[PDB]
Subunit: 333 residues, 3 copies
């Protein structure tokens, strides 16, 4: 088919955990969906101690933004590597077929750009990440990863074939960082990326992250940046981990319908407490809130959550249901 006869629609991306507007049920036929991302190498402070790393980002954020299309749309990405960066980058889409997910076709030095097109033939949430030959884990674990959602053309379905429609969607990217340490255990102070490379490799080879964070930093999805919902709202939380297993859990809630390995032709798992998202995968969980208040959303390795950073909050408004839960006798002597 002549792709030039298809509609083109340009998407304007937004910063995670928010997601660009889209339709769950496709209101048009197949389209070429046009995205642009600009790579930015930048310093990021990732914890409360002030630890600063040299992050590698798509569009200035860790994670990169969530892209949303429908099955059998074409994704057309303009990828820009400005001359203010210093490294070679590319992109691998797990949604795509061929050429190492796109990475063999998208190598851009500083001062270069490229445009890749692929057909999104399989529905699901998928990781995307940089993958420069010989340096792959360093770029990924420096923050250069995000996700793409390929919706079925008739939207999401439950285990019986009935529609599932979310009211709100959030994208939680979880990032394992490997900040090199000296013998005494302090994070090393590097002058350039090349001077950092061997100790970055050493640090990665321990297989022990120093930090595991949501949306790029300890505490990023708390306080004024907590996730929000109301009682009765249907929320989809897309969660990705490009390099290491995670096990999300909504403290005080559930995943009512979960695609733990993210692929919508499969029926969802029901009523999950915790789900395993393997490293290199995106998953999605659908929940209808039933109680107001604060919820924590965590990796349920609780050390990873509360000591290394993999914890966010929901603030949920509405009525308390004392049938579902109540304090019969409040704490007392």
């Amino acid at each position: 088919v002549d792709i030039s006869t298809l509609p083109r629609v340009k998407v304007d991306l937004v910063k995670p955990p928010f997601v660009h507007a889209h339709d769950q049920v496709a209101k048009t036929g197949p389209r070429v969906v046009e995205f642009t991302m600009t790579i930015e190498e930048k310093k990021l402070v990732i914890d409360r101690e002030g630890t600063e790393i040299h992050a590698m980002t798509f569009n200035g954020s860790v994670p990169g933004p969530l892209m949303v299309v429908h099955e059998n749309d074409y994704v057309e990405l303009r990828l820009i590597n400005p001359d203010t960066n210093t490294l070679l980058h590319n992109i691998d889409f797990h949604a795509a077929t061929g050429a190492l997910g796109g990475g063999a076709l998208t190598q851009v030095n500083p001062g270069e750009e490229t445009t890749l097109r692929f057909k999104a033939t399989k529905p699901g949430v998928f990781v995307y990440h940089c993958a420069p030959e010989g340096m792959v884990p360093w770029h990924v674990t420096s923050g250069m990863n995000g996700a793409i959602m390929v919706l079925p053309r008739d939207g999401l379905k439950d285990e019986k074939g009935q529609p599932l429609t979310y009211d709100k969607i959030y994208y939680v990217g979880e990032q394992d960082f490997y900040v090199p340490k000296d013998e005494a255990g302090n994070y090393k102070k590097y002058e350039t990326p090349g001077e950092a490379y061997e100790d970055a490799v050493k640090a990665m080879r321990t297989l022990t992250p120093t930090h595991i964070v949501f949306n790029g930093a300890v505490g990023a999805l708390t306080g004024d940046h907590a996730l929000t919902a109301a009682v009765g709202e249907r929320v989809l939380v897309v969660h990705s981990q490009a390099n290491r297993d995670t096990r999300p859990h909504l403290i005080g809630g559930h995943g009512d319908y979960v695609w733990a390995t993210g692929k919508f032709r499969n029926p969802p798992d029901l009523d999950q407490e915790t789900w395993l998202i393997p490293g290199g995968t995106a998953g999605a969980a659908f929940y209808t809130f039933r109680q107001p208040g604060v919820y924590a959303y965590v990796n349920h390795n609780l050390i990873e959550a509360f000591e290394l950073g993999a914890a966010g909050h929901f603030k949920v408004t509405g009525e308390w249901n004392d049938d579902l839960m109540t304090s019969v006798v409040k704490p007392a002597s």
Copy 2:
């Protein structure tokens, strides 16, 4: 509905791996099921070397006891923190909805008690654990976790909708401990919980357990405390891990029907050799024994099993079936 019009039934809990008597198919309408647990801080010897830790327990055991109710029963827990303990505790039920699983409503200082009620709206096996704000992984990884089973009102079903009925049930709680080590590798000798806290945090942050045990100690489910069955018996093994992934395996057997992430509205996985239970989850495996003798039940990271403690035994009585397995030629020169 006025909960005061419902029947009340008091459960008397038992020490894992045994489980309090219950009905698989509910013989009454919904009930308020009353449980009591008393928190006990105590010294426990956890390995053959004599390593002694300061454990934090529900009802004196690691894991805490298995609670069993039916879907849409109400769980009413009296939680007691006697004045002989020194820390603040609470409880989070993954089965419950709201208030951080109950933790926001159940904070008890030494000398206090509380009573929580929640509706068990989802069937499955679920973790429960202590979760005091700011100290969550320390309490969990000190042993303060167990599980609750919410049975469907019409009992368990196979992948085709046919009944599955167990003859025996066991609860295996798997505990990762993080005993702080000095530089030379020996376990440190602490005077109070507050003096221990920073090195406990340091130890946890390595993400490398020093011990991984069933029922609270190396060897706990061996010898005179081996699990038992007879050929032809249907056994359900509930397995929980509140903090870290595990992968159970019955050496010489299978999981004929497994809910690896523990939720009974989902069809079970058939004929599993090994299953992944993510950290923060309870799972359940159903097996009908076909051969007598000794079986080992392990985490099939065999280092975790045989070097760090995550191994128990079954002793199974009955007839040997030489059609299913035989030695044709015994070892010989």
Copy 3:
């Protein structure tokens, strides 16, 4: 039934990643399928640096060869431990029922052999491994493991009950090695297995592999030993990990149908990007190639893949499909 009335067929095994010839759909009734394996202890170089270990193998390879039978065949294995070896060995089949998978019946000292028979009552791919009492993880993590495939008698089926037929099959065994290190981080230089045992145990207890490899060495499934396919070919990749979780991914492709925990009575998961195979399990993924070129097949902990060894290649011949993927604008200033 009198097993002596059944046909006997002798299989001649082949070196992984290749697989002995077999039929997907059984062309005979149940058979006794006769296998022989000879244990070989040997030095193996496992990385590009020249690190040499004392490996323990079935039939001279890491992994041991893939055995293939049909459901309700009998597997009859002659296991030979020649007098040129120095250790006691045995075998545990996860496909088998009873006697610790066979291990209690197959203990062979150097200079001994044995013959075990078992009925393959459950379809799926399964691990087999050595398991000598008290030394289990050392033998497994020295390479003494492989897999067995028990096909349904009417071959593989999709999630709807329709046939799935592969054109090619490969067996990828993934091996975690724990080469002891000195304080400075270099691999130690041992004189005998007994002198090595305590530092092997120490190394294993770190839970941090020094090497994670496919087919026995870094790079083993690259270059002249890359896996091969053509566009349009249906390929089954069987992947096992006897001791530690892995998460396979085909870079530039998918698992169209995946049995992540390897058991064919279950419907496959569709359209997977990455799948979790728990330690102690074999899994299988079915893919139809749609694009030519080089693909990498990896554990998608990318550190494990690209820094520790868990990466292979496919070389795929055929036509490029520019509808599925194209470079619209090649990299340029």
